[PDB]
Coordinates of C-alpha atoms in Angstrom, one line a residue:
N1 CA 0.0 0.0 0.0
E2 CA 2.6 2.6 1.1
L3 CA 4.8 1.4 -1.8
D4 CA 4.6 3.4 -5.0
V5 CA 2.1 2.2 -7.6
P6 CA 3.9 2.0 -11.1
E7 CA 7.1 0.8 -9.5
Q8 CA 7.1 -2.1 -11.9
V9 CA 7.6 0.5 -14.6
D10 CA 10.8 1.9 -13.2
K11 CA 11.8 -1.7 -12.8
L12 CA 10.6 -2.6 -16.3
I13 CA 12.7 0.3 -17.7
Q14 CA 15.8 -1.4 -16.2
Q15 CA 14.8 -4.5 -18.2
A16 CA 14.4 -2.3 -21.3
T17 CA 17.8 -0.8 -20.6
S18 CA 19.3 -4.3 -20.6
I19 CA 17.5 -5.1 -23.9
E20 CA 19.3 -2.1 -25.4
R21 CA 22.6 -3.8 -24.6
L22 CA 21.4 -7.1 -26.0
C23 CA 19.8 -5.6 -29.1
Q24 CA 23.0 -3.6 -29.8
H25 CA 24.4 -7.2 -29.9
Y26 CA 21.8 -9.4 -31.4
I27 CA 20.3 -7.1 -34.1
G28 CA 22.9 -4.3 -33.8
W29 CA 20.5 -1.3 -33.2
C30 CA 17.2 -0.8 -31.4
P31 CA 14.5 -3.0 -33.1
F32 CA 11.7 -1.5 -31.0
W33 CA 12.5 2.2 -30.6

């Protein structure tokens, strides 16, 4: 309850940030954005 509400977002972003590192490797650039 006291916790924030969209906290997953801020945590998701971290995931997305990692995907950037992977993408730059797998495809080379950002396939989504």
